[PDB]
Amino acid sequence: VFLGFLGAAGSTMGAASMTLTVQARNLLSGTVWGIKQLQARVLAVERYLRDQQLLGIWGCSGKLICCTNVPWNSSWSNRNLSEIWDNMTWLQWDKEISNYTQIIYGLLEESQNQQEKNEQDLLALD
Amino acid sequence: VFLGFLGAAGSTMGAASMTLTVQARNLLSGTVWGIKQLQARVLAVERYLRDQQLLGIWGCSGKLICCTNVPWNSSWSNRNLSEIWDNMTWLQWDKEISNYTQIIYGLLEESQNQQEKNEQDLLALD
Amino acid sequence: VFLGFLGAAGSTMGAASMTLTVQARNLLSGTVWGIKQLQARVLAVERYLRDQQLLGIWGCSGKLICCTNVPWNSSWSNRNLSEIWDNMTWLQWDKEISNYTQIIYGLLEESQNQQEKNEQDLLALD
Amino acid sequence: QVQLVQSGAEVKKPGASVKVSCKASGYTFTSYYMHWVRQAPGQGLEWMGIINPSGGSTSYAQ
Amino acid sequence: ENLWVTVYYGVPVWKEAKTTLFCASDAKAYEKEVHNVWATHACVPTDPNPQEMVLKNVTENFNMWKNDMVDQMHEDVISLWDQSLKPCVKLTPLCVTLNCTNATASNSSIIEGMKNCSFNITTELRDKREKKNALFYKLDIVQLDGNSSQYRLINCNTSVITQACPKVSFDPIPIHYCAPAGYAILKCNNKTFTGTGPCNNVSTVQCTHGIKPVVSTQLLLNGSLAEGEIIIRSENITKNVKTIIVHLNESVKIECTRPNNKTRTSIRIGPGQAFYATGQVIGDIREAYCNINESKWNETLQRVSKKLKEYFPHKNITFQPSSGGDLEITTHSFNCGGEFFYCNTSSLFNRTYMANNSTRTITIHCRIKQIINMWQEVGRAMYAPPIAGNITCISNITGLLLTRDYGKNNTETFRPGGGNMKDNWRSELYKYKVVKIEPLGVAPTRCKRRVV
Amino acid sequence: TELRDKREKKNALFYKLDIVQLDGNSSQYRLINCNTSVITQACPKVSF
Amino acid sequence: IGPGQAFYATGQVIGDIREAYCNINESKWNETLQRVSKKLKEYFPHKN
């Protein structure tokens, strides 16, 4: 089934994660005015790679869903989410936490670098 | 040794897998008519990324050889392959199973999504 | 903090590895003369992918720092490095070992292929 | 560098006609509307009309 | 409790954005090897499939006055018209003093300036010239500022006039638009949508339907119809607005014709160049005209008035005819048959309304012109060869472009407007918005990562 | 100018370093570079 | 010249005649060159 993009979209997070592979894959599908066709294609590629590299920097290069060790806290958004996780959903969530993405990403980088150092020391002691 | 592409090619699968790193790497090596040089280079890049992303979707982003948990069955091609694995070889194999690639890929996606869910539940219960 | 590139640069290796994520990420940031803007952007992308693929060939696709099993030897550069590791530093190091990069890379490929074969046999025997 | 330039005029006899004009630059001429207004010493302001230089048509106060 | 950061990739979240959209076309090629059409539209991937996905519980805001795609339609239309004259002969050698006496004219519509207009042309060898003559329509011929017996082409002392190649004659080709990867186009499925505010029925497509590059003033023709009743779209900040767009839910058929029959002639210029002009005219004389059904015209305007008063909910409504300006803004302009028509529509908007089919044909009179200063540019005039024989043309009327003016009393006054080509395209692109997708984001979860 | 059919006698001032004597009668003059190359003018808008 | 073309040239000249010229301060010109000479002789460390 080709759901294109933004198929769900109106759904709960539950539930919405079921199509992460759809949006991940439909993202790579692409007289002097033709110069713009090439420019648009170059932009699509560069943007893809920047996000893929960032997942690698955070230690999540191989996954659509990735669990890490930066703790969640209340200096950020403030929701218990016992019901709201499955009732909000995504657009509203990003707006609610829109003032923290530049903060969280910084924590993710620090956490991954610490883990890499710990791995190197443990292997060195082998 | 630069074997270029399709060096073996006439060999058994045995045997043929010995050069997977050759074909994997030689694949990235690339007045108004010059617009076509850029178009050709863009196409080579986009095609590479689409295949690399797909291996990631199936859980095999880091490997040339990858083992998964979709069972083989007889609704697909029908060969015992005790000898034929090492006597066929690749061109003939793809022709024999040419009617199933659009089926197998669907199974690979389902298998990987199930494993990712299982990992998240196991970590959540930690 | 945006350190751009080559921030340290004059430092010991110690110490210098602390910014590997900086140089890794600042590397992807990009009338007929405009044809050159597209050509330059295509070159930046192709060069990035070639290095990323090579780390994958050696088994280090997900890491900035990667430990492998090719032994170090004296047929290459000759330094004890007990102090020099943290006193040389990088430009001088590459010059000292400039005659061996075409050798070491060959060893890295062989080591990774052997490990992949060993994994397949161990899984097959499961 | 947006500028408007106007010429002067004489005193006319009752029943006579007068022509006045305005030149303008620093912005594309055909990209905007122009207005004319009138005020006499000791009086308030009145709107007279609008002209669209792009085409064009006009509209005037009754 | 014990929440940790988790990261997801492939989240269905989007933002408004400015981008570049690309054309898409129909399955059938132009097939004339024309750079501005065959290589511009016929070599464009064809038949995109609009497999619309309807989204449950999605609300989005659609602003049709301000968006980022109407301007692209405008630029694409201009680009084609400039390229279409690229390989075609310039008429510079024709800008010579003309001697047109109209001695043989048989009608008042002719004798003003058309018959046997003569000139001295050097051709084909540079060494020799001959006296030639041809017929030109009167609206394009002006008196030389000298003796009244001397004439000049209307635009040749200020700009370049070029002719068109038969192969580049351009009729409408519907153009479909598609987003580049990472972008999506949203439609607003609301039959009563007026161009502003939220829509509670949102769906997405990989392509829009085709929109034809049709240019007109006063009346909107060949377009789609409103699903329900007549919808009048306007701005809601101040009442001093430039354009009122009336979209009908029923078409009115208009039939037009140019009843005479013309002979085409050709004056050689040089090695692959010739000037086309009118030769002998057949055979009696009738003026060009258009036919409108009376009951449909009157019913349609009564229904428009009923809805128009919603924006002006007070006194009555009066319509008026064109007040002034050049012909494109005062007449109904169209290009049936490849020739340009300027019809007098002043008889059609003289109705008044107040608070509390194939019969009685309404006819209007039309004129034609050959040298056109197109809406797209200045300084580069396009000429047009005559089309031999007569011209017949049938099209559908889907809407009106109205403006407002001062009445003589306390009622509202409306009249036909136009010239803003963007208001034609904006009348079909009102349904689309383009957004970008940003798939990466974070959320809390009851999960920690193993160190080992 | 402007109609190809008619011509007029015009005159203007040019600076002396750009005017050369025609290789003939001394009363006749030529633009300094026009017998060997193309001379173009500049648009006011491109003054740089 | 034609339909969007014209040649620009000089018309009446006003109104008396003076040659074009440039003004330089004397002490700065002389001091500057003396300092240049002082450094130039480093490359040519011999005669004047």
Residue numbers in the entry:
A (entry chain Z), B (entry chain J), C (entry chain F): 518 to 548, 570 to 664
D (entry chain C): 1 to 52, 52A, 53 to 61
E (entry chain A): 32 to 147, 157 to 309, 312 to 321, 321A, 322 to 359, 361 to 398, 409 to 504
F (entry chain E): 163 to 210
G (entry chain E): 309, 312 to 321, 321A, 322 to 357
Give verbatim lines from the article:
The trimeric HIV-1 envelope glycoprotein (Env) spikes that mediate virus entry into cells are vulnerable to at least six distinct epitope classes of broadly neutralizing antibodies (bnAbs), where each bnAb class is a major focus for vaccine design. CH235 and its more mature lineage member, CH235.12, utilize VH1-46, neutralize 18% and 90%, respectively, of a multi-clade panel of 199 Env-pseudotyped viruses, and do not require insertions or deletions for this neutralizing activity. The inferred unmutated common ancestor (UCA) of the CH235/CH235.12 lineage, referred to here as CH235 UCA2, exhibits micromolar affinity binding and weak neutralizing activity against an early autologous CH505 Env that differs from the transmitted-founder (TF) Env by a single N279K change, suggesting that this variant (also called M5) initiated the lineage. Here we used virus neutralization to identify two point mutations and a modified glycan profile that together render HIV-1 CH505 Env-pseudotyped virus highly susceptible to neutralization by a germline-reverted form of the CH235 lineage of CD4 binding site (CD4bs) bnAbs.
To understand the structural basis for CH235 UCA2 recognition of Env with the N279K and G458Y mutations, we determined the structure of CH235 UCA2 in complex with Man5-enriched stabilized CH505TF.N279K.G458Y.SOSIP.664 by cryogenic electron microscopy (cryo-EM). 3D refinement of the ab initio model against the cleaned-up stack of particles, without applying symmetry, confirmed three Fabs bound to the HIV-1 Env, following which 3-fold symmetry was applied to obtain the final reconstruction which refined to an overall resolution of 4.2 Å. The CH235 UCA2 Fab bound at the CD4 binding site, approaching each protomer at an angle similar to what was previously observed for structures of other CH235 lineage antibodies bound to monomeric gp120. The CH235 UCA2 Fab used its CDR H2 to mediate key contacts with the gp120 CD4 binding loop, exhibiting the CD4 mimicry that is typical of the VRC01 and CH235/8ANC131 classes of CD4bs antibodies derived from the VH1-2 and VH1-46 heavy chain germline genes, respectively. The CH235 UCA2 also made extensive contacts with loop D and loop V5, which are the sites of the N279K and the G458Y mutations, respectively. The side chain of gp120 K279 adopted an extended conformation that allowed it to stack against the side chain of N93 in the CH235 UCA2 CDR L3 and form a van der Waals contact with the side chain of gp120 F353. The CH235 UCA2 CDR L3 appeared locked in place by its interactions with loop D and loop V5, with UCA W94 sequestered by cation-pi and pi-stacking interactions mediated by loop V5 residues R456 and Y458. Apart from interacting with the CDR L3, the side chain of the engineered gp120 Y458 also stacked against the CDR H2 of CH235 UCA2. A change in conformation was observed in loop V5 to accommodate the bulky tyrosine side chain from the G458Y substitution.
